[PDB]
Structure formats: structure tokens, C-alpha cells
């Protein structure tokens, strides 16, 4: 017993699908971790009730397996969303994000006085899970902010 959901999707023979993505996060993930330089079939389902009965976002992608490190980097945007690896309509191994030990090269120290705001340096933050929140700490500025205040691209 493999594929049997009474909902419409567009399976990708040999590809990567990331489901259960919170509203306004699907677009965010395809507009952040840049999932567009791909002359390969990507299907963008936004605000769809495919997984469960809530408003989710689905990113079907052909042969673009994001390593266990590029998936963890999603745990900061859609910690619930699972990510399914599929082998020719014949699915394989599933998974669901794990808070990175760090998030280098993507975010930005919100610190106006931080040094990485003036020199050729790749941004970096040790990821720390806390109570009702995640704490990001520059390797440079050394201060620490809430993932909701750290903007990035």
C-alpha cells in the first residue's frame, strides 16, 4: 500500500517533495533558498489542503535532493513540514527537519554595529533551541537574537 490520498498532486518520477509547509512559507522557501535555477519540473502548490486539513504549501521538485543539511536549514521556517524523497513514482525514505547546529551564509546580524555589516564575511549563527523560541548568535557580533527578528536571503 503506497500512494492513495483523495487529493490532487503532481508526483515527480525521481524527485524531491516537501510537504506540510505553513502558509506564507512555501513561497518564502522558494524565494529564499532559491529553488528556481532549475530547468527541471518544479511544481508550486501554495495554500493547499493536501497533507492535513489546514492551509499548507507543497513544493514538488524533480531530482533536487537537498542534503540533510539543506533540509535542516528549513527547520527554522517549517519545523513540522516533512520532506519526502521519491524513486520513480515509487517513493522512498521520508523525513522531517532538524534544527541546524548553525545557519551560515543565509541570515544577517540585525546588529547595526555588528562588524559583518561592512566587511566581506559570510554570516553565521549557532542555532540554540530554547523555551518558546530559537536563539541565533553571530559568530562575529556575538550578540543573540530571536529567529523572528533575523531577516535573510
Amino acid at each position: 500500500m503506497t500512494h492513495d490520498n483523495k487529493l490532487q498532486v503532481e508526483a515527480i518520477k525521481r524527485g524531491t517533495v516537501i510537504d506540510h509547509i505553513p502558509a506564507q512559507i512555501g513561497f518564502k522557501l522558494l524565494s529564499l533558498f532559491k529553488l528556481t535555477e532549475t530547468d527541471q519540473r518544479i511544481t508550486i502548490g501554495l495554500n493547499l489542503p493536501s497533507g492535513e486539513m489546514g492551509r499548507k504549501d507543497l513544493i514538488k521538485i524533480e531530482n533536487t535532493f537537498l542534503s540533510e543539511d539543506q533540509v535542516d536549514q528549513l527547520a527554522l521556517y517549517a519545523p513540522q513540514a516533512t520532506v519526502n524523497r521519491i524513486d520513480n513514482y515509487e517513493v522512498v525514505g521520508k523525513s522531517r527537519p532538524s534544527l541546524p547546529e548553525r545557519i551560515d551564509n543565509v541570515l544577517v546580524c540585525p546588529n547595526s554595529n555588528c562588524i559583518s555589516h561592512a566587511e566581506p564575511v559570510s554570516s553565521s549563527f549557532a542555532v540554540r533551541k530554547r523555551a518558546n523560541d530559537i536563539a541565533l548568535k553571530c559568530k562575529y557580533c556575538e550578540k543573540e537574537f530571536s529567529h523572528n527578528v533575523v531577516l535573510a536571503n
Partner: protein
């Protein structure tokens, strides 16, 4: 080779209790038996991109007393990183090819960290990280505290100045939390409170800490009353209200204080401590400043000399 040979000194958050105790141990020794030619053929860079008096002169006198040569600038305004608009990364890449170690102070957080990523295997001693860390200032503090108190654990330490932009309390607090049974008393304006990542560090370690709206209260049982000046230059316009010291120490204030108690202070002061406190026995900010030569003479000798100095 000692634990600290060739290592960089960017954050008190990156050293261990042993690393710390090793500096103090060394500092002691050199204070007793000096070694005029220890760093004889060494040439060190004193890079200050922000104002400084003690930190640079205490540091620079420390090199001469270990026979080292000094080269550098005290004002980034007459450098190519000022007139010819060039990056810091580059500035550090070239210097690192002339000197044996780089002592740098910058007005921007994480600037010393940045230099490490460019100074090829050449130690970078963070003089003062913009409002962030200040490893060398904490050593004076420890060496001084243990001097006056005789220990580093089981202390009632109170911190009074601007705790948010106070790079001196950031370090010293992480360091004292590396010793057992230390109790902190944080006094300061709500706007410039002790930064959270620090408080969170205390709870993880389960260290005791409380807040108070006045010195007078904890005055009774504090061994170290560590006051600080208001980092006016790092403040934000929306905080200029705190520009004036909101807590002032007067001789009279030390009427019901313990005897072993001392008043410390990375020193540029501005009325937080009345000049009438200098006559008092509890005064120790200036003496605390003097240990500067020791602490820093110790750090230099452990980072540039493979063997343990005697």
C-alpha cells in the same frame, strides 16, 4: 607547548577555567621574577581603531618589559583604512606578514574575530571588541579580585554601570561564572540591563543572580562592587536618557560595607564614583588598573613563548 601558545584571544567565552588559572598563575610568577628579554626578538602590533589610554599603554608597556618591539597605530585616521578607504580584512592580511601578534581594538563588534580569519596563524589579541568582549580587561579583574579577595569562587559580586554596552562586564561575568558558588547583583537602568544571553548562561550553570534598584542595599554584603561608566558612544539616540550615570558612589555610601570589600572599575569614570572615595580603603580601581601590566604581561608570554615562563 602550553594551552595558550599561538592561540587567539577573542572571547572569554572561548577559554576554560584552566586557561584562565594559567594566566593568573603566570602573571603571579612574572610579577615576582621578571624576564626582561623573554620576548626579545618578537615584534607586536598595537592596532587601536578606537580611543584608548590604559588598555593601549598598559599593553604596550607590557611588551617593552618583556623586551618586545612595538609597531602600530592609535588612530585609524592616518592609515590606509582611513584615507584610502580599504577593508579591514586586507589591512589585517598585510600586517600579519610583518608582526608576531596583533593586538587590536575596534569600534565594531566581532572585529577581532574577523581578523583571525585573515591573520595567518598570527595570534590576534582582542584589545576591545566594540561593546562585546574585552578578554584582557577581565584578566586584570580576576588577578585583582583574587588578589584582594584571595579567591575566585564564593564571591558576592555586584555590577553597577551600563550593563548592556559594557564589554567589561560581559566578559567578567562569563569568567566568574566559570568558578563555583558566585553570586551576582546586577544594578542598572532597565534600558541598559544585563544582556539576556548572559542571564541565560547563568541559569544553565545555575548561578545565583538578582536585580536591585540601588547600591545601598547589597552594599552590606558585596565583596566586589564593580562599577562601570555609561558607554555613551555605543548608546542609541533612543537611549540618550541614560547618558548620565544613574548610580553614584560616595564615601558615605561605604559606611556599612564589609572589610575585605573593594571597589573596582575598568577605569574611565565620570561621576559614578565621587572623587572622595579615592581616600577610602575600599578604593581599588587604580590599583586594579596597575595589575594591568601583570595580567597582560602574562597573556603575551603564554601566547608567544612555547615554554611556561618558569
Amino acid at each position: 607547548a602550553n594551552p595558550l601558545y599561538q592561540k587567539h584571544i577573542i572571547s572569554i567565552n572561548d577559554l576554560s577555567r584552566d586557561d584562565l588559572n594559567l594566566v593568573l598563575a603566570t602573571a603571579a610568577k612574572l610579577k615576582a621574577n621578571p624576564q626582561p628579554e623573554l620576548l626579545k626578538h618578537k615584534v607586536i602590533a598595537s592596532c587601536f581603531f578606537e580611543a584608548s589610554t590604559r588598555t593601549r599603554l598598559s599593553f604596550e608597556t607590557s611588551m617593552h618589559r618583556l623586551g618586545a618591539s612595538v609597531v602600530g597605530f592609535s588612530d585609524s585616521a592616518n592609515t590606509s583604512l582611513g584615507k584610502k578607504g580599504e577593508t579591514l580584512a586586507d589591512t589585517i592580511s598585510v600586517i600579519s606578514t610583518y608582526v608576531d601578534a596583533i593586538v587590536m581594538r575596534h569600534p565594531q563588534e566581532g572585529a577581532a574575530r574577523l581578523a583571525t580569519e585573515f591573520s595567518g596563524n598570527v595570534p590576534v589579541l582582542n584589545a576591545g571588541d566594540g561593546s562585546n568582549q574585552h578578554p584582557t580587561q577581565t584578566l586584570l579583574d580576576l588577578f585583582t579580585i583574587q588578589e584582594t579577595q584571595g579567591r575566585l569562587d564564593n564571591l558576592h559580586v555586584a555590577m553597577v554601570g551600563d550593563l548592556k554596552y559594557g564589554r567589561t562586564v560581559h566578559s567578567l561575568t562569563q569568567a566568574l561564572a566559570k568558578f563555583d558558588g558566585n553570586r551576582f547583583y546586577f544594578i542598572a537602568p532597565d534600558a541598559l540591563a544585563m544582556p539576556q544571553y548572559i542571564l541565560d548562561m547563568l541559569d544553565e550553570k545555575g548561578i545565583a543572580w538578582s536585580l536591585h534598584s540601588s547600591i545601598e542595599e547589597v552594599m552590606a554584603e558585596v565583596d566586589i562592587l564593580y562599577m562601570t561608566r555609561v558607554q555613551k558612544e555605543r548608546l542609541d539616540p533612543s537611549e540618550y536618557a541614560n547618558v548620565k550615570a544613574q548610580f553614584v558612589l560616595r564615601a558615605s555610601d561605604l559606611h556599612n560595607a564589609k572589610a575585605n570589600m573593594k571597589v573596582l572599575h575598568p577605569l574611565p569614570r565620570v561621576d559614578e564614583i565621587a572623587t572622595d572615595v579615592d581616600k577610602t580603603p575600599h578604593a581599588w580601581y587604580f590599583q586594579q588598573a596597575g595589575n594591568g601590566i601583570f595580567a597582560r604581561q602574562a597573556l603575551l608570554a603564554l601566547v608567544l613563548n612555547r615554554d611556561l615562563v618558569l
